[PDB]
């Protein structure tokens, strides 16, 4: 009871938006970006028979995803207008998914405001944060963006590359530090760390290997 019986089934329920999570935060990096995991979301949330309208917010996506019901180019307009627009596409009425391609573009001191104006009983927000993009005084003690985002999130999905070749993790690390990008990254098969924050407040962690080709999820450590 204190930990999940079948974590894979939990995972699927979160992916399918059956289980309620109003703010799902995805963490990625250049070695394995998030768009495949996002695809898993839309897949599972249609494969259990759902049909959610999806509002897609784009700071860095020029190709309109096929699954999206509304598309917003956030790159030209300011914060207030953006929030206005997002809301204008949202509602009992029906269940909407709000996808933000990158939270790195929103100033840290605006994060809580953003999450609070958008929040709603009919909205699930799925948002990506790139762990390797750095944020843009000395007695300012406000948490950094990642710390805050993780605190506000109801679900965290942290994405990592799964290496197949002859380079180990630290070798790939130093190569990536020199921007000598190696082969063998950004694969259909990748690793996932799920933190599910229960109603009780307890945060539970599970590791999965995910195949985004076949949509088969298996458990790890």
């Amino acid at each position: 009871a204190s930990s999940s019986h079948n974590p894979v089934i939990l995972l699927k329920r979160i992916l399918s938006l059956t289980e309620s999570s109003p703010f799902i935060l995805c963490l990625d990096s250049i070695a394995q970006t998030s768009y495949k995991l996002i695809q898993e979301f839309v897949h599972q949330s249609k494969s259990k028979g759902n049909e959610y309208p999806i509002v897609y917010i784009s700071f860095e996506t020029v190709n309109k995803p096929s699954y999206c019901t509304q598309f917003i180019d956030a790159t030209q307009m300011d914060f207030v207008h953006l929030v206005k627009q997002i809301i204008s596409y949202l509602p009992q009425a029906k269940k909407h998914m709000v996808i933000i391609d990158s939270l790195n573009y929103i100033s840290t001191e605006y994060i809580t405001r953003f999450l609070s104006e958008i929040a709603s009983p009919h909205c699930t927000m799925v948002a990506t944060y790139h762990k390797d993009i750095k944020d843009e005084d000395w007695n300012n003690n406000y948490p950094d963006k990642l710390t805050l985002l993780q605190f506000m999130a109801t679900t965290i999905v942290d994405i990592d590359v799964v290496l197949t070749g002859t380079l180990d993790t630290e070798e790939v690390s130093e190569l990536l530090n020199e921007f000598r990008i190696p082969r063998g990254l950004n694969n259909d098969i990748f690793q996932l760390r799920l933190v599910n924050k229960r109603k009780s407040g307890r945060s539970l962690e599970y590791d999965f290997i995910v195949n985004s080709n076949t949509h088969e999820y298996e458990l790890l450590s």
């Binding site: 860095e60 530090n177 921007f179 990008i181």
Partner: protein, 263 residues
């Protein structure tokens, strides 16, 4: 010994369907250290698009095409590319060179707000593409230099106000950047040059393919290596089988000629 340049699974370098599919936008990200410069790769790409194949690399009759190339640089003047391409016999009516070195500081920067500087640059691109919208490739060399030339310019403003709009107007965009900042011995680019480093990370994230040139870490036989890698974004294509064919080539560049081969 000698290898052909191949980027994608249909054996192509610059798939003609990248220019026939519509509403599609694809970004190539090419990075290089300053001891392994990319001129020959730039030429080969122009060659591929205009003449039809990277003949300077792989190996021809007079031909004619609509295919067009827009070439821009923040570090090289117009004569540099004009001379380079003339030597390859690319028809001058099939390309256009935008010079952001010549008089750039004295005109386009000095006493002028960030927003207007970026908007003017973008406008030059828009004018250039406006002519041949769907048969045009755009190549832009060292745009990251703007982060240094323009006081208080952040990576996110550069992307929001120039790069991303540019890409939104292109079938195919090719960004060429110098990766020297990641290769200083005893110095962490991540921590201390974060504004600059963010540009390379975000560019990678948006690209569907990354080509990178580097010197070897470990001969007079070899200039360096070319790596071909997936980028962080999917290929925008109707062909659901099209993928990047990741690869490593060694290459020797000398006497204005280049040869790719395998280790």
């Amino acid at each position: 010994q000698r290898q052909d340049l191949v980027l994608f699974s249909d054996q192509s370098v610059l798939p003609a369907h990248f220019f026939q599919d519509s509403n599609s936008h694809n970004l190539f990200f090419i990075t290089h250290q300053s001891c392994t410069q990319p001129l020959w790769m730039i030429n080969a790409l122009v060659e591929t698009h205009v003449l039809g194949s990277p003949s300077s690399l792989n190996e021809m009759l007079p031909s004619s095409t609509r295919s067009h190339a827009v070439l821009a640089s923040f570090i090289h003047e117009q004569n540099y590319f004009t001379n380079s391409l003339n030597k390859l016999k690319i028809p001058s009516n099939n390309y256009n060179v935008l010079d952001f070195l010549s008089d750039f500081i004295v005109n386009n920067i000095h006493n002028k707000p960030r927003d207007k500087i970026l908007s003017d640059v973008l406008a030059k691109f828009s004018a250039a593409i406006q002519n041949n919208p769907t048969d045009t490739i755009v190549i832009i060399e060292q745009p990251e230099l703007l982060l240094s030339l323009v006081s208080g310019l952040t990576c996110s403003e550069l992307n929001n106000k120039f790069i991303t709009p540019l890409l939104r107007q292109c079938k195919v965009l090719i960004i060429v950047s110098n990766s020297d900042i990641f290769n200083i011995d005893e110095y962490d680019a991540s921590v201390h040059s974060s504004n600059l480093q963010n540009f390379y990370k975000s560019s990678f994230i948006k690209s569907m393919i990354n080509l990178n040139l580097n010197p070897l870490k470990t001969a007079k036989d070899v200039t360096g290596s070319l790596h071909v890698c997936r980028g962080g974004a999917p290929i925008a294509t109707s062909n659901t089988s099209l993928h990047v064919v990741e690869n490593e080539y060694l290459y020797l560049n000398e006497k204005e000629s280049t040869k790719l081969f395998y280790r």
